[PDB]
C-alpha cells in the first residue's frame, strides 16, 4: 500500500499548499492543508456555521454511507496563528492519492475563525504530527498517517514542496527519483509531539558556516522560516535597507534588493535556500517594501522550519519506532 498526491500552492507567494483528499462514500473531494505541526483532520462541513463558510467545499456527512457520528466526541484546536476551529466528530473512509483509510476520525467544524473563513482555497487541515497532539475528547483520536502506517510498505511519507509550482506527498515509499545525492537522516524528539529536530548550524550567503545547534520543528503548516533573533539578525544585516518594523511586525527589505541564500545544516550536510524563496513580495499592494521569509522566533518560543526551508529540500518523515527526519537536495 502506497499513495502519491499532488500538492499545489494556493497563491503566487506559496503561503500554503493544498492536496486533494477523498472523504466518504461515495467520495467528496476536499482540498486540505497537510500540516505536519498539528494532529487533527478537520474539514468545513454541513454543520459549519453558514456565516463562516465563503467559497469553501463542505463535507456533507449525511451523504456519506460510510459516515458515522462519534457520539459525545468533540474537538477544539488553536494555532500559533491564533487561528481557531472546533466542533464534533465523525468516522469515515478517507483516501489520499489512492491510499485508503477506513474509520478515520474526521472532525467536522461547527465553528471556524475569521482566518479560515477568509481563506477560500482551504477546505480544512490534515495533521501529520504525532497523535498525542490530537485534540478530540474524551477519546483522543489518531492521525491519518498513524492509521496507514501498518498498511504501508514503509511507515513513511515524504514532502517535496515546489517553489511557485506543484509538488508531491508520497506515503509508503521514497522516490529515489525526486532528490539529488544522499538523504541525511537526523534524530527526532517526539517529546512535545512535533517532528522536532536539531540543526547543526547556518551560513548566510557565501559566508562562513557557524556551527550552532538550532532546535525547531519541521512544519509544512507554516509559511515562513522562524529562527532565533541572533541568526535572523545576521541574515538581514547582509541586505541593504532591511530593518525590523514595529508597524508591519517583522523584517522588511526594499523590493529592489538582492536576497542572499540561507544555508542550514543537517548533520554534516547543508541545504541552501535560494535567496528567491525568501522574498514574499510587497508588504502591501503598490509598496516598494517587501516582506522577508526569515523572521525571528523570539515571540513563539519555538523555531519553525516552515515551507520556506522545506521547499528547498526533499524531506522524509520516517515514522518508525525510532522516528527520523531525512533531508536531501533537489
Amino acid at each position: 500500500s502506497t499513495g502519491s498526491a499532488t500538492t499545489t500552492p494556493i497563491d503566487s507567494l506559496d503561503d500554503a499548499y493544498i492536496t486533494p483528499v477523498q472523504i466518504g462514500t461515495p467520495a467528496q473531494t476536499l482540498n486540505l492543508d497537510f500540516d505536519t505541526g498539528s494532529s487533527d483532520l478537520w474539514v468545513f462541513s454541513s454543520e459549519t456555521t453558514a456565516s463562516e463558510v465563503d467559497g469553501q467545499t463542505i463535507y456533507t456527512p449525511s451523504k456519506s454511507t460510510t459516515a458515522k457520528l462519534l457520539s459525545g466526541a468533540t474537538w477544539s484546536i488553536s494555532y500559533g496563528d491564533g487561528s481557531s476551529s472546533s466542533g464534533d466528530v465523525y468516522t469515515d473512509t478517507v483516501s489520499v492519492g489512492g491510499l485508503t483509510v477506513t474509520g478515520q476520525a474526521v472532525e467536522s467544524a461547527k465553528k471556524v475563525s475569521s482566518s479560515f473563513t477568509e481563506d477560500s482555497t482551504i477546505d480544512g487541515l490534515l495533521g501529520l504530527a504525532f497523535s498525542t497532539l490530537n485534540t478530540v475528547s474524551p477519546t483522543q483520536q489518531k492521525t491519518f498517517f498513524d492509521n496507514a502506517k501498518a498498511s504501508l510498505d514503509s511507515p513513511v511519507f515524504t514532502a517535496d514542496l515546489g517553489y511557485h509550482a506543484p509538488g508531491t506527498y508520497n506515503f509508503g515509499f521514497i522516490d529515489t527519483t525526486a532528490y539529488t545525492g544522499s538523504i541525511t537522516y537526523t534524530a527526532v524528539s517526539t517529546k512535545q509531539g512535533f517532528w522536532e529536530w536539531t540543526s547543526t548550524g547556518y551560513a548566510v550567503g557565501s559566508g562562513t558556516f557557524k556551527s550552532t545547534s538550532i532546535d525547531g520543528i519541521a512544519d509544512t503548516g507554516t509559511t515562513l522560516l522562524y529562527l532565533p533573533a541572533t541568526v535572523v539578525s545576521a541574515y538581514w544585516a547582509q541586505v541593504s535597507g532591511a530593518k525590523s518594523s514595529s508597524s508591519v511586525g517583522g523584517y522588511v527589505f526594499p523590493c529592489s534588493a538582492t536576497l542572499p541564500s540561507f544555508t542550514f545544516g543537517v548533520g554534516s550536510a547543508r541545504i541552501v535556500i535560494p535567496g528567491d524563496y525568501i522574498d514574499f513580495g510587497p508588504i502591501s499592494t503598490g509598496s516598494s517594501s517587501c516582506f522577508g521569509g526569515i523572521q525571528s522566533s523570539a515571540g513563539i518560543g519555538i523555531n519553525i522550519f516552515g515551507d520556506v526551508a522545506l521547499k528547498a529540500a526533499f524531506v522524509v518523515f520516517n515514522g518508525a519506532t525510532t522516528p527520523t527526519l531525512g533531508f536531501a537536495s533537489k
Binding site: 497537510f34 505536519t36 505541526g37 488553536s78 500559533g80 503548516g221 507554516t222 515562513l224 513563539i300 519553525i304
Partner: peptide, 6 residues
C-alpha cells in the same frame, strides 16, 4: 502566511 498547534 499561516502558522499551523498551540
Amino acid at each position: 502566511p499561516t502558522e499551523x498547534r498551540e
